[PDB]
Scaffold this active site. Sequence first.
Site, short mmCIF file in Angstrom:
data_model
loop_
_atom_site.label_atom_id
_atom_site.label_comp_id
_atom_site.label_asym_id
_atom_site.label_seq_id
_atom_site.Cartn_x
_atom_site.Cartn_y
_atom_site.Cartn_z
N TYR A 134 0.84 -1.19 0.00
CA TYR A 134 0.00 0.00 0.00
C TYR A 134 0.88 1.24 0.00
O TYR A 134 1.79 1.37 0.83
CB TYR A 134 -0.96 0.03 1.19
N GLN A 195 -10.85 -0.61 0.67
CA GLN A 195 -11.14 -1.35 -0.56
C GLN A 195 -9.89 -2.06 -1.07
O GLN A 195 -9.93 -3.24 -1.42
CB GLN A 195 -11.66 -0.40 -1.63
N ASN A 218 -3.44 5.51 6.16
CA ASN A 218 -4.27 6.32 7.03
C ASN A 218 -5.12 5.40 7.92
O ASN A 218 -4.99 4.17 7.91
CB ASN A 218 -5.13 7.26 6.20
N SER A 241 -0.08 10.03 12.19
CA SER A 241 1.13 10.79 11.94
C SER A 241 1.45 11.67 13.14
O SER A 241 0.62 12.47 13.58
CB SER A 241 0.95 11.65 10.69
N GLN A 263 6.45 17.13 10.18
CA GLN A 263 5.35 16.22 10.46
C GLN A 263 4.00 16.88 10.22
O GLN A 263 3.06 16.24 9.74
CB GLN A 263 5.44 15.72 11.90
N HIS A 266 2.33 16.72 6.69
CA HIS A 266 1.95 15.44 6.10
C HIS A 266 0.45 15.37 5.84
O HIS A 266 0.02 15.01 4.74
CB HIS A 266 2.39 14.28 7.00
N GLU A 331 5.49 7.27 18.69
CA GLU A 331 6.12 6.34 17.76
C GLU A 331 7.37 6.95 17.13
O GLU A 331 8.24 6.20 16.67
CB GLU A 331 5.12 5.91 16.68
N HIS A 332 7.48 8.27 17.10
CA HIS A 332 8.65 8.97 16.57
C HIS A 332 9.09 10.01 17.58
O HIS A 332 8.32 10.91 17.93
CB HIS A 332 8.34 9.63 15.22
N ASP A 365 11.82 9.61 7.35
CA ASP A 365 10.81 9.40 6.32
C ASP A 365 11.42 9.09 4.96
O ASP A 365 10.74 8.52 4.11
CB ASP A 365 9.90 10.62 6.20
N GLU A 419 1.32 -38.66 29.34
CA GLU A 419 0.13 -37.89 29.06
C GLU A 419 -1.01 -38.73 28.49
O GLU A 419 -2.03 -38.17 28.07
CB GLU A 419 0.45 -36.75 28.08
N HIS A 424 0.57 -40.98 19.78
CA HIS A 424 1.89 -40.35 19.74
C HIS A 424 2.97 -41.34 20.16
O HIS A 424 4.00 -41.49 19.48
CB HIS A 424 1.92 -39.14 20.67
#
Lengths: 438, 418
Positions: A134, A195, A218, A241, A263, A266, A331-332, A365, A419, A424
């Site tokens: 993607y 989609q 996104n 973001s 940032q 974006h 995250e950043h 990035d 067992e 087995h």
Amino acid sequence: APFAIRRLNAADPDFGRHLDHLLSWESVSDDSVNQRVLDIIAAVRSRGDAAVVEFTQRFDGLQAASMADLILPRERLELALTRITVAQREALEVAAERVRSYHEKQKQGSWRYTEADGTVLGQQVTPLDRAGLYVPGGKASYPSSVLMNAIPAKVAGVSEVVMVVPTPRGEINEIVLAAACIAGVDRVFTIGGAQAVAALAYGTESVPRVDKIVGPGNIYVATAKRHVFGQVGIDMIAGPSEILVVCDGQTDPDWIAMDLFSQAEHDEDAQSILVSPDAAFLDRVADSIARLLPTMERAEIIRTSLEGRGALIQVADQAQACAVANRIAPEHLELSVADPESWLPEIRHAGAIFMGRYTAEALGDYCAGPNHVLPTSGTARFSSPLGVYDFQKRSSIINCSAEGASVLGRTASVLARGESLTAHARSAEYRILDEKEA
Amino acid sequence: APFAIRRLNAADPDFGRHLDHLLSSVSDDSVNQRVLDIIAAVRSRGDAAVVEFTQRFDGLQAASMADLILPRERLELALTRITVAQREALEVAAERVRSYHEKQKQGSWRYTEADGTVLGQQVTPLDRAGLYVPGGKASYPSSVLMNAIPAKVAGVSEVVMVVPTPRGEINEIVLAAACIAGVDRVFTIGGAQAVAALAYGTESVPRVDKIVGPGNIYVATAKRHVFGQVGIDMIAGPSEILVVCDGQTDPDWIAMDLFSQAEHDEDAQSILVSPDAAFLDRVADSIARLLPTMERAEIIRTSLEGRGALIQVADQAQACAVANRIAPEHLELSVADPESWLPEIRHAGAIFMGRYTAEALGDYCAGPGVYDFQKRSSIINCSAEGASVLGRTASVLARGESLTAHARSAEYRILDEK
């Protein structure tokens, strides 16, 4: 009317509540997008190509009678490579060389090892048949995201790398398509959102079902990826973001403002926050923002995202700056301080970390993957299940000798019998040897 | 009266339709909604929901959640209760697993480029890991060893095990393996409610950072739905074996290899593929004769009746094509030259090669990861020269997409040449 960046002070008694609201508010609620995503997925699973075309028309504003109009031939990727400037092409090729050389060194394949008793152990390593990548549509789509995903897939030997990139209003990012050409992307569909994820995860008449879906999306793509988890492999669920900049006040305030702008430009929902104990420095950054914002080419997007989720946060000292950073859990993280490795031990919740005054997350990035190290020959020495490993399937093998099966069978018998899993036990016991038996 | 195993033939024109049905009881949507309901109930009602579901699904009586907590001393007690041979098997396997993961562990690192740029990763163990262990007899101790040991080697401070006790039944070999593997706490809970309790936390069950261990469809579905709230290792498929045989393996061996997977649970799938028609008849005979002698014959029979089959194919090439379509999680290549067959079966999981390697050896491995129990922060600390090298590439690409704040942010750090 100069722009006045939102200001927060950890000394204010309402700080925790005001920071809480800054980090959590949403215009479109959860479960709203999530119900929306679930409806898209089920619709693509039921109506296939037709649903993909219908949703592409509605959400991307595209005129496409059929799914054939949403397929970009590979000649179009070559044409993109010729349309960009020479400096842009060479920059892409430089980035690709650094990525390609790194993943080549990290690639490992099948192996076999013979034990003393003749038993053979090993792994059979094969590439995934198909990978789906993607790529965001429009201008805010880092060509790195194409290079950092398609190149390791091709290095692993994935026969078919399928790229989905929406073209809102027919807008095409030639640098992104040129990156796809250089990276070896095989086919491209001009689709996006849930989609595209659903079409890649389950397959339609025209979109092939892939083994793994990768790339940054996104909220709609991220939510769709979480819902098709288990049905298809996924790399990660990217968050919103965001950047958190922590600064001791010794970095150029224009640099810090532009790092926030990086940032903020974006998308409109981006979150850009600066934390510092230096009050005079924060005032200078506020001045820097007001002076630099008006002539930014993406000033309207930057202004919107800073208005909605931007802030300069005053703290008492380095300790409180790290406490706020841990609460934000970015995250950043840009650790723009003199001694970044000294601040790190008090940073408990952070993803990718950019250290010192010379490292902006804009480099992340464009030169690295999401929370991946910069690809160099030195960093290639440190293995990682990401990269080429992510685009390979591994099958453990064990090939017992007659004697090896006897040794292992006695242990398997003991535990299986203990067992009461006697099938087995008997299965292993069939292969236990006794040379004196005639 | 004698059991007649299902037979398929790839020479039949309708073979694909029968195979599609074989590979496709309780509906997924039924289990999925039950799992969703259970997760929502545990999140809303905490301990009370866990106790309620444990009473209903595990058939036990527990006044409160305190009755569902096993102290670590209970694991030490279990280690004293197993036999000498069972304990030695577990301790030997543990040493091999533990020694292997010590060698493979990678901690924080830094590399300094020639231009002074420092790259690396800050590596920290997860705070807490949750280990799911199936209840009762059909629970391999290797699942405990190979999950809890790498977590402890990584440095996870708290490994929490959930194991249901159906009707109060406890598996001392499993608890002993948990003792040896360093499990810190044990809750006698299972199913989707155990997964939900670990993922979200209750009054008595701690929220963990990652949930590992294989379970039946309820556990796998629950793990799929808590992904995002918590890390997870994998989503297990149904218990399954595909045996591919050229016809020159003892038919009682092959029948028992099928029984070995079929005895795990009623939804297990055991399939045999062979070009040797007479051999398949012998395996069918072996199944009919051996089935009533098995301790778990009722489970085996239900599994074989529902999901088992012997499949005739034309030759080695078609055997591999059928095998590749089945895409088995375990593949037993009971043939003369197994390395000649494997290239045509790339969609198989774990592979057991030759006539002497039964898939049961995989469930009871004697021992020979850590990365899965660590969190990593990638670090880039550019020198002025390194930021110039990276900045020149980033500046051109960013300006090509009109991301000028990206470009100017990088361009601040670019040094001029001479």
